Design an enzyme around this catalytic site. Structure first.
Site, PDB file in Angstrom:
ATOM      1  N   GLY B  11       0.893  -1.175   0.000  1.00 44.70           N
ATOM      2  CA  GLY B  11       0.000   0.000   0.000  1.00 44.70           C
ATOM      3  C   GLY B  11       0.926   1.218   0.000  1.00 44.70           C
ATOM      4  O   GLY B  11       1.961   1.210   0.678  1.00 44.70           O
ATOM      5  N   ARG B  72      -0.328  -5.241  -6.925  1.00 44.53           N
ATOM      6  CA  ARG B  72      -0.306  -6.540  -6.237  1.00 44.53           C
ATOM      7  C   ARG B  72       0.070  -7.587  -7.290  1.00 44.53           C
ATOM      8  O   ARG B  72      -0.676  -7.706  -8.277  1.00 44.53           O
ATOM      9  CB  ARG B  72      -1.670  -6.719  -5.590  1.00 44.53           C
ATOM     10  N   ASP B 127       1.242   2.078   8.639  1.00 40.21           N
ATOM     11  CA  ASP B 127       1.007   1.184   9.743  1.00 40.21           C
ATOM     12  C   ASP B 127       2.074   1.123  10.832  1.00 40.21           C
ATOM     13  O   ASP B 127       1.702   0.825  11.993  1.00 40.21           O
ATOM     14  CB  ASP B 127       0.734  -0.241   9.211  1.00 40.21           C
ATOM     15  N   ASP B 129       4.223  -1.147  11.135  1.00 40.61           N
ATOM     16  CA  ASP B 129       4.387  -2.560  11.442  1.00 40.61           C
ATOM     17  C   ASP B 129       5.419  -3.224  10.537  1.00 40.61           C
ATOM     18  O   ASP B 129       5.152  -4.136   9.731  1.00 40.61           O
ATOM     19  CB  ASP B 129       3.026  -3.243  11.521  1.00 40.61           C
ATOM     20  N   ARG B 171      -3.998  -2.498  10.380  1.00 38.72           N
ATOM     21  CA  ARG B 171      -4.605  -3.830  10.307  1.00 38.72           C
ATOM     22  C   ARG B 171      -4.303  -4.761  11.462  1.00 38.72           C
ATOM     23  O   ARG B 171      -5.202  -5.436  11.996  1.00 38.72           O
ATOM     24  CB  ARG B 171      -4.130  -4.464   8.978  1.00 38.72           C
TER      25      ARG B 171
HETATM   26  N1  ADP Z   1       6.823 -14.979  -1.033  1.00 35.34           N
HETATM   27  C1  ADP Z   1       6.888 -14.010  -1.945  1.00 35.34           C
HETATM   28  N2  ADP Z   1       7.755 -14.129  -2.997  1.00 35.34           N
HETATM   29  C2  ADP Z   1       7.794 -13.095  -3.898  1.00 35.34           C
HETATM   30  N3  ADP Z   1       7.124 -11.975  -3.926  1.00 35.34           N
HETATM   31  C3  ADP Z   1       6.304 -11.929  -2.860  1.00 35.34           C
HETATM   32  C4  ADP Z   1       6.107 -12.845  -1.863  1.00 35.34           C
HETATM   33  N4  ADP Z   1       5.155 -12.387  -0.971  1.00 35.34           N
HETATM   34  C5  ADP Z   1       4.766 -11.196  -1.435  1.00 35.34           C
HETATM   35  N5  ADP Z   1       5.465 -10.872  -2.556  1.00 35.34           N
HETATM   36  C6  ADP Z   1       5.393  -9.758  -3.498  1.00 35.34           C
HETATM   37  O1  ADP Z   1       5.152  -8.491  -2.948  1.00 35.34           O
HETATM   38  C7  ADP Z   1       3.879  -7.947  -3.493  1.00 35.34           C
HETATM   39  C8  ADP Z   1       3.448  -7.035  -2.328  1.00 35.34           C
HETATM   40  O2  ADP Z   1       3.039  -8.079  -1.398  1.00 35.34           O
HETATM   41  P1  ADP Z   1       1.769  -7.858  -0.500  1.00 35.34           P
HETATM   42  O3  ADP Z   1       1.658  -8.906   0.574  1.00 35.34           O
HETATM   43  O4  ADP Z   1       0.435  -7.777  -1.147  1.00 35.34           O
HETATM   44  O5  ADP Z   1       2.153  -6.410   0.166  1.00 35.34           O
HETATM   45  P2  ADP Z   1       1.537  -6.010   1.624  1.00 35.34           P
HETATM   46  O6  ADP Z   1       1.858  -7.121   2.572  1.00 35.34           O
HETATM   47  O7  ADP Z   1       2.315  -4.808   2.029  1.00 35.34           O
HETATM   48  O8  ADP Z   1       0.090  -5.902   1.346  1.00 35.34           O
HETATM   49  C9  ADP Z   1       3.118  -9.258  -3.683  1.00 35.34           C
HETATM   50  O9  ADP Z   1       1.866  -9.225  -4.339  1.00 35.34           O
HETATM   51  C10 ADP Z   1       4.168 -10.071  -4.433  1.00 35.34           C
HETATM   52  O10 ADP Z   1       4.579  -9.839  -5.775  1.00 35.34           O
HETATM   53  O1  F6P Z   2      -5.842  -0.461   0.575  1.00 43.60           O
HETATM   54  P1  F6P Z   2      -6.693  -1.638   0.857  1.00 43.60           P
HETATM   55  O2  F6P Z   2      -6.422  -2.731  -0.089  1.00 43.60           O
HETATM   56  O3  F6P Z   2      -8.137  -1.326   0.932  1.00 43.60           O
HETATM   57  O4  F6P Z   2      -6.224  -2.164   2.311  1.00 43.60           O
HETATM   58  C1  F6P Z   2      -6.411  -1.319   3.457  1.00 43.60           C
HETATM   59  C2  F6P Z   2      -5.176  -1.553   4.327  1.00 43.60           C
HETATM   60  O5  F6P Z   2      -4.036  -0.801   3.791  1.00 43.60           O
HETATM   61  C3  F6P Z   2      -3.551   0.049   4.882  1.00 43.60           C
HETATM   62  O6  F6P Z   2      -4.230   1.326   4.809  1.00 43.60           O
HETATM   63  C4  F6P Z   2      -2.067   0.381   4.607  1.00 43.60           C
HETATM   64  O7  F6P Z   2      -1.256  -0.777   4.704  1.00 43.60           O
HETATM   65  C5  F6P Z   2      -3.972  -0.706   6.162  1.00 43.60           C
HETATM   66  O8  F6P Z   2      -4.054   0.017   7.391  1.00 43.60           O
HETATM   67  C6  F6P Z   2      -5.393  -1.146   5.793  1.00 43.60           C
HETATM   68  O9  F6P Z   2      -5.916  -2.254   6.527  1.00 43.60           O
HETATM   69 MG    MG Z   3      -0.548  -8.336   1.650  1.00 41.67          MG
END
Ligand code: ADP
Ligand code: F6P
Ligand code: MG
Ligand code: ADP
Ligand code: ADP
Ligand code: ADP
Ligand code: ADP
Ligand code: ADP
Ligand code: ADP
Ligand code: ADP
Ligand code: F6P
Ligand code: F6P
Ligand code: F6P
Ligand code: MG
Ligand code: MG
Ligand code: MG
Ligand code: MG
Ligand code: MG
Ligand code: MG
Ligand code: MG
Lengths: 319, 319, 319, 319
Positions: B11, B72, B127, B129, B171
């Protein structure tokens, strides 16, 4: 007269305090004494009345809300209610009343003159839905609060190339949504006073997307329906990643804007000039950029409309 | 090295652009060339890569969101995915990668080093975090966005003597809610990391009301549950007129704060100093007010906690 | 102890009130009673002391300045002065003193312990020039005030392709100018703690101009000299249309930032924890992101420095 | 027509970009093509003209300054100048010109119609000193910038019980100072259009001080004289600790206010409606809350005045 009262009723708005402040200063300049009614109509009945001195209104100009508080008094609709309150005024020797508030509130100012208490209404709502005035105290403030939100939402929305449905206040009026939408570069503005066709709305969104727009911002006046229903509807039909934001009550607070501060000052003063000149039963406002005053009874007959041409403009600049 | 890449994932957060800007300037000062990956991991695979010149990062310092966009990419979790993306880097002659983003994002930076691509993670989330850092880029900004809301809500809430339940983001972390609640004079802070007893929470509210408090402000981290459920619960038990506000995504945008701007600058630079010095697989941060760097794999093992003492303080000053 | 005092001295800073508020709440939670000294040292002598009740500190968290006022007391330097003031404390039965203020102010807290009055200093200045603390209460606020100015100046400056010399506060410290300059994308930062060569400064400006930069922003800490002299100097040497802005006292007011609000809260509390635990003659602060406390006498020996590396960074990102 | 031009001249103002944006969108909606002139009149001559596409004006609504830049062209006063520029328009096939700017600027729009180039002036100045309009684009913004300053200055000024002389822009007009002073609770407003008596000004200050006012705020339009001379004068005569603040150019930048954004939108559109309808040589504005248009030659004859009654109000509420 030598003694007047002042109170705030309906939903609070940014600029109520600058209003209170001009009534208080205007009256004293004139050697009249000012009494404050706390809790609006409710405390009128309960006799919650204190004298306001020149300095009690010092350091409130820049503040939101109302230092006199506000309350809902469904007992003031009642004869007895208006009696009890009328008694309280006399018990205190208060001859006139400046009432800052909504239309609900103006209705009570009216009932009061009919029983002999000269009252002047000061338009205080963030909604801008008060007849007799182009602008209500607090509307400019709410506007700036909302575009502050839109500005922020645009950043996040561009980032992730998403569509946002933003729900703004204005129960039955589309002013907030309309001026906001325009100032905010919104792609759609759904207001109560205009017909919209959801299919056209969709077509227009799709077409902007194709033409390479990163985000998409949709403003919905609470008056039309829920930000969540439009979000749902729109996402279903476009397949675009959508999010909904309900601004809510942040719309209602804050340090009033320059305009709101000037407007409230000028109107609160004017209201006092009327009580002294013996006028009564009137409401103040700004029309065609001039201070005007009406008969409450007649301004209430009138209806609230928007600049339909501004709505069109909305549609043309959103290409 | 002579060529590096930079991308934003997860995000978006206020301060991503000041980050991008220091990576870009830091690298060029050093005579290294910088390439931008658009749409995060997703565009890494798709080969959405453009060279960034010294001036392409001019006039972004004060802006929210990310000029490189974010997306994503669930296809990057995949071997093939990491292959395709790895290919794209080579096709462009990119040797290192600065990744600004969340933990999800750090995971991909990790997978990339394991296949031979030196990467450094820059903590970008509102966040707070992210392990390895006290502070994440964008948290200060979100904080100020929220107290901006609280300030406004307090005005309206004092006016009508009401109780407000305000739902903030974070979150799984209570940072936003905790610092906000404190800075905002809140009467209750419900965070994930602390136990709360709804009966005690009620008792404390009642007791403040009796002791003459006009309003009441309750901060609930989305992580705990819904602003609407707590509103419901609280109103039922106190009989106080309650309202709920879900700040939502306004938390995510805006012009970053001074701290956020300095923090992002310093960290984005540092990240480049590491790629050049051949370090790789690390993540940057600020600890005990000093720039530190960890092994992504080990910083990820670690857990995110809050200052429990700050939470206590919350409870003592709220009397 | 059962009774403490609290006062504000030196130049006011945003966050003094959140400080006052934690001392007041912290002390009462603890069943101790708090007394306010108005007009700092000056009113200490004059016996301008009033009891502070739990609610007297309600609705001050978000406000700038100090509700207890502040004054310059050159009569407190005097034995007699410290005697008269010491008498006033006893006359009121006040056993401890929380002093929120500058270094000048800490000196008086020191003189007071030496005569038997336990005192703790709370760093309140916008300057950030107080030993024992990384950060002083009000610095974050001033910072944001300044970049707010820079942001605006950049708009006008880009418009007309001009060079702006901006003079910021910080009499002997370069913190404001340094963090500001960095957060603001400034092209030059002239601070007291670093050597600058006007010829190099010129060379660097010229070189950025040629490389196509529209505007140019120069931050000068008042500590170095006048915005007008640098403007003059620079215009003469580059032939670029220059303008000078002296921010002045706007730097000193405003609604404190989230950090400032948390920082002040935490430190004002901590100060009370020390008076109760019988510590005295100490000063509080934040070091390496942790609450620390020193001996006033020794923290005063120490000197205020900046992160020279941050200054370098300044120079590298400004290309 | 099928091709128009748009340019910004005079001092930049917040809202110029929303203006540019409506001219651009309004014209395209209408199937007309828009050309941008960079550097105002100066680049008109130099032929600094680029086509503006629908999306080039995307993401500028909320921004300060002007994306087309502005410059002073004393060569446009010249026949040759107007010839050279007129040639440049034809070379590009540009038939009409929207000019957003000051009065200086309107003069050139006039000279252009006289030689056959239809032009419409859009009032863009922070000063509000343009005939034919109640309000100029950027004035609302400057206002809010100034009360933002006053709000801050009031905090520091209350703290130390001091008097502040604040110098605001508006070279020959007192609008900024007047609305500011009012919205800001100022104790004195020295504008060009009103007579002031320094002895009365003093008397009034003294009297407020005695009546227990902590601070004192004095607004001086640059048009009257220097903040430093009034500071000097006032301190000498009252013995009150005085400070002077010259806001300067911060007045000129920032993200335009909602009003400014709506106003600019509506006027920039309207300007296009006139070029298409073949009108030319006119200037747009808002009068008595309605969109009006005049003959440049006649609107220029007219003079700029203020609401003297608003100035009185100033004096009555300042008690
Ligand atoms: N195990 C993984 N290996 C490679 N890329 C990853 C992995 N986990 C997450 N990512 C990459 O990072 C992008 C951002 O991850 P995402 O979890 O959605 O961000 P956030 O946790 O901040 O929401 C993912 O959609 C993906 O391409
Ligand atoms: O942007 P989305 O996909 O609606 O997800 C919202 C989440 O993203 C954040 O705003 C930033 O990581 C979190 O606090 C919240 O839960
Ligand atoms: Mg995620
Ligand atoms: N009688 C008084 N007692 C205490 N403070 C006062 C008094 N009168 C004014 N003040 C304070 O002095 C400052 C300037 O006063 P004033 O001009 O009357 O306020 P404002 O500009 O808000 O109307 C403000 O902080 C105000 O609240
Ligand atoms: N017909 C009426 N007679 C007297 N008072 C009235 C009348 N209608 C409304 N009011 C008074 O004004 C208060 C504010 O009215 P309300 O409708 O709730 O404000 P709003 O319309 O702005 O919400 C009412 O609760 C009541 O005391
Ligand atoms: N090569 C360039 N072309 C056009 N505009 C530029 C160029 N380089 C810088 N600018 C602009 O000049 C101003 C000052 O530039 P710079 O110092 O590099 O930006 P910043 O302070 O944001 O890093 C900004 O508006 C910037 O975007
Ligand atoms: N005893 C009291 N009398 C009047 N107003 C009070 C009292 N106690 C609190 N308030 C007001 O109630 C609101 C909430 O109170 P409180 O939680 O104590 O304030 P804060 O969050 O600023 O510390 C604020 O407007 C505060 O000033
Ligand atoms: N040596 C001292 N002994 C006692 N009080 C002192 C001493 N030095 C300063 N102070 C007190 O603190 C007040 C604030 O000091 P000052 O130097 O003006 O603050 P600042 O350094 O922050 O400007 C002084 O006017 C005085 O009463
Ligand atoms: N053709 C385009 N190419 C790139 N970005 C575009 C394009 N058209 C619009 N955008 C961007 O998409 C977002 C929404 O677009 P638009 O509605 O036209 O802007 P605005 O609301 O500022 O007028 C903004 O960031 C805008 O700059
Ligand atoms: N008599 C004129 N004929 C043509 N152009 C003019 C005339 N007067 C001013 N202008 C043009 O407008 C530009 C903006 O004028 P200027 O007076 O500097 O703006 P402002 O009055 O707003 O400062 C001038 O430099 C010049 O090119
Ligand atoms: O404050 P309440 O009672 O929740 O009512 C909300 C209503 O008040 C307003 O905010 C102000 O009148 C309306 O826009 C909104 O519908
Ligand atoms: O407030 P005074 O007395 O004019 O002093 C100004 C000084 O106060 C500060 O604003 C705050 O300590 C310094 O930066 C500045 O030099
Ligand atoms: O921008 P310059 O050339 O310094 O001129 C300053 C003038 O411009 C304005 O800011 C805007 O027209 C005037 O108030 C002020 O006198
Ligand atoms: Mg109602
Ligand atoms: Mg748009
Ligand atoms: Mg509270
Ligand atoms: Mg000193
Ligand atoms: Mg720069
Ligand atoms: Mg001129
Ligand atoms: Mg005043």
């Amino acid at each position: 007269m030598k003694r007047i009262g002042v109170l705030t009723s309906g939903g609070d708005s940014p600029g109520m305090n600058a209003a209170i402040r001009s009534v208080v200063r205007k009256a004293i300049y004139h050697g009249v004494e000012v009494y404050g009614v706390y809790h609006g109509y409710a405390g009128l009945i309960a006799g919650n009345i204190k004298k306001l001195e020149v300095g009690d209104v010092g350091d409130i100009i820049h503040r939101g809300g109302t230092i006199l508080y506000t309350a809902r008094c469904p007992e003031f609709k009642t004869e007895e209610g208006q009696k009890k309150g009328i008694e309280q005024l006399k018990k205190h020797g208060i001859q006139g009343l400046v009432v800052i508030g909504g239309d609900g509130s103006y209705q009570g100012a009216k009932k009061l003159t009919e029983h002999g208490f000269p009252c002047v209404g000061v338009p205080g709502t963030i909604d801008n839905d008060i007849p007799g005035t182009d602008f209500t105290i607090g509307f400019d403030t709410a506007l700036n609060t909302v575009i502050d939100a839109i500005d922020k939402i645009r950043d996040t929305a561009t980032s992730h190339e998403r569509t946002y449905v933003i729900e703004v206040m204005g129960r039955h009026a589309g002013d907030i949504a309309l001026w906001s939408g325009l100032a905010g570069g919104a792609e759609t503005i759904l207001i109560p006073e205009a017909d919209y066709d959801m299919n056209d709305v969709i077509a227009r969104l799709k077409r902007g997307h194709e033409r390479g727009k990163k985000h998409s911002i949709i403003i919905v006046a609470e008056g039309v329906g829920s930000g969540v229903d439009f979000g749902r509807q729109i996402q279903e039909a476009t397949g675009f990643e959508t999010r909904v934001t309900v601004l809510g009550h942040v719309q209602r607070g804050g340090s009033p804007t320059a305009f709101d501060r000037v407007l409230a000052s000028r109107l609160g003063a004017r209201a006092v000039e009327l009580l002294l000149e013996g006028k009564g039963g009137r409401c103040v406002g700004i029309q065609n950029n001039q201070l005007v005053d009406h008969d409450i009874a007649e301004a209430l007959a009138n209806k609230h409309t928007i600049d339909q041409r501004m709505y069109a403009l909305s549609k043309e600049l959103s290409i």
